[PDB]
Design a protein around this ligand. Structure first.
Ligand code: HEM
Ligand code: CAM
Length: 405
C-alpha cells in the first residue's frame, strides 16, 4: 500500500521502505534497515509506505535534524501521522523551552541518584533470576529473563502491582510494534484508563513511588495538573516496559553465537563498560521522528510544512562514515559513535538506569553461565517498529558447565 507521491517530491528521491515490515528482516532487523545506507540510496529519501514520509539515512543528517527543533518539531513524533497526532506524552511531544521544565521533573524519578539507590535491588533480582534458571539447562530468554528483569524493577520503582504486567505490556507493544489488533489512539486510551485512577489516589495519599512523585511535582513554579502527570507517567510506562527488554535479547542472541566475545568479557572484566557501549551501537533499536514546522530546504531537498521525517536513531552508529566496519562487533573500538539514546534536547533520561541493567546482566550471567548457545533448529525472528525486538530466544546449555555463585 503506497500513498500517491506528493507534488514536491522528486521521483529519483523515492525509496519505498516500510519501517514496520522491512524487506531483509530475515537477515536481522539492523541489517534490514542498513539497506538504506547502500551506495544506490540518497542521503535523504521519501517512502510511499505508511502514508508517505521522508527518511534521513546518514548520521550527520540525523544529528542535525535532532538539534534543530525550530524546523523539526517533536509535536508529531510517530509515523503514521494518525499515531503521531494521537501522541501526547510529556516531555517527548514538546519542544524547548517548554520541554525543559517537565524534563527536570522526569529526571527526578529516573535520573542517576535513583539508579544509585536501586543498585542493590537490580543486582539482587538479576542474580536471583539467573540462579533459578542455571540448573535447567534451557530457557526462552525473552520471557524468562529479558522481560521480567527490567519490568519488575520498573514496577518496583513505580509502585505498581506485578499482576498488571501482562495487560500493560500488551498495550505498550501495540504502540511501538503495531499488531493491527488496535489503533494507537485506542492503545493510548486504555493505558490512560489504567493510570487515571492511580494518579488520583497518589495525589491524595502520596507515597515515595515515581508516580506519587510525578503526580505531586511542581512545574514552572506551579503544581502539575492531573492531565500533565498522566501524560508523563504514560511515557515512563512505555520506556520502562519496552526498551531495555528488547535490547537485552539482541545482545544475548549475539553473545550466544560468539564464544570469543563471551570469553573476552570473562577474562577481561574491565572491558564490560566498553563492550556495553559497542553493543548499544551495533544493536541500536529505536526509530522515531519529527514534523516540519514550515517549508525548509534541507541539504538541497525541499521539505514542506507538515511533512513528517523519520530520523532513525538506530542508523547513526551503523553509518560507515561514522564507524568503520559497522556490522562488525569490536569491543576495543577506539571510538564508539552512536545516537542510540537519542540526540538533542530529548536525550534519553533513563539511559543511566538502562546501562546499569545491561552491565549487571552481562556480568552476572557470564559469571554463572559462561557457555550457552541458541537451541538447535530454532529460528530467531526480529520485529521492526518504533522500537525493534526479538520474538523469542530459545537458549540451551550444559548445567555441568555452570557455576553456582
Ligand atoms: C536501552 C533502552 C533505551 C533506549 C535505546 C532509549 C532510547 C530513547 C530515545 C532514542 C529517546 C529520544 C526520543 C526522541 O528524541 O524522540 C528517549 C527518550 C526518553 N527515554 Fe529512553 N531509552 C531507553 C530506555 C529508557 C528507560 C528505561 C526509561 C525509563 C522509563 C526511558 C525514559 C526516557 C524518557 C523520560 C525520555 C524522554 C526525554 C525527553 O523527551 O526529554 N528510556 N529514549
Ligand atoms: C522512542 C521511545 C523509545 C522514547 C521512550 C519510549 C519511546 C517509545 C517514546 O515514545 C519516546
Amino acid at each position: 500500500n503506497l500513498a500517491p507521491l506528493p507534488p514536491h517530491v522528486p521521483e529519483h528521491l523515492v525509496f519505498d521502505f516500510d519501517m514496520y515490515n522491512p524487506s531483509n528482516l530475515s537477515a536481522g532487523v539492523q541489517e534490514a534497515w542498513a539497506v538504506l545506507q547502500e551506495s544506490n540510496v540518497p542521503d535523504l529519501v521519501w517512502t510511499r509506505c505508511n502514508g508517505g514520509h521522508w527518511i534521513a539515512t546518514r548520521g550527520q543528517l540525523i544529528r542535525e535534524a535532532y538539534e534543530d527543533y525550530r524546523h523539526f518539531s517533536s509535536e508529531c513524533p510517530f509515523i503514521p501521522r494518525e499515531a503521531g497526532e494521537a501522541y501526547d506524552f510529556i516531555p517527548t511531544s514538546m519542544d524547548p523551552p517548554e520541554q525543559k521544565q517537565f524534563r527536570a521533573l522526569a529526571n527526578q524519578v529516573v535520573g542517576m541518584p535513583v539508579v544509585d539507590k536501586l543498585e542493590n535491588r537490580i543486582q539482587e533480582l538479576a542474580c536471583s533470576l539467573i540462579e533459578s534458571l542455571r540448573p535447567q539447562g534451557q530457557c526462552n530468554f525473552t520471557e524468562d529473563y529479558a522481560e521480567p528483569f527490567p519490568i519488575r524493577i520498573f514496577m518496583l520503582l513505580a509502585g505498581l502491582p506485578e499482576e498488571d504486567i501482562p495487560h500493560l505490556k500488551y498495550l505498550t507493544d501495540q504502540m511501538t510494534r503495531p499488531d493491527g489488533s488496535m489503533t494507537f489512539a485506542e492503545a493510548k486510551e486504555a493505558l490512560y484508563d489504567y493510570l487515571i485512577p492511580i494518579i488520583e489516589q497518589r495525589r491524595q495519599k502520596p507515597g515515595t513511588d515515581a508516580i506519587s512523585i510525578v503526580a505531586n511535582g511542581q512545574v514552572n513554579g506551579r503544581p502539575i495538573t492531573s492531565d500533565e502527570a498522566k501524560r508523563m507517567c504514560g511515557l515512563l510506562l512505555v520506556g520502562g516496559l519496552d526498551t531495555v527488554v528488547n535490547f537485552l535479547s539482541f545482545s544475548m542472541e549475539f553473545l550466544a553465537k560468539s564464544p570469543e566475545h563471551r570469553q573476552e568479557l570473562i577474562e577481561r572484566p574491565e572491558r564490560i563498560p566498553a563492550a556495553c557501549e559497542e553493543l548499544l551501537r551495533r544493536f541500536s533499536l529505536v526509530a522515531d521522528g519529527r514534523i516540519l514546522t514550515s517549508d525548509y530546504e534541507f541539504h538541497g531537498v525541499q521539505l514542506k510544512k507538515g511533512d513528517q521525517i523519520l530520523l532513525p536513531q538506530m542508523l547513526s552508529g551503523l553509518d560507515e562514515r561514522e564507524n568503520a566496519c559497522p556490522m562488525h562487533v569490536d569491543f576495543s573500538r577506539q571510538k564508539v559513535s552512536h545516537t542510540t539514546f537519542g540526540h538533542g534536547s530529548h536525550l534519553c533520561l533513563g539511559q543511566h538506569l538502562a546501562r546499569r541493567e545491561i552491565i549487571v546482566t552481562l556480568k552476572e550471567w557470564l559469571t554463572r553461565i559462561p557457555d550457552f548457545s541458541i537451541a538447535p533448529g530454532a529460528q530467531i525472528q526480529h520485529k521492526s517498529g518504533i522500537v525493534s525486538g526479538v520474538q523469542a530466544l530459545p537458549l540451551v546449555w550444559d548445567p555441568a558447565t555452570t557455576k553456582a555463585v
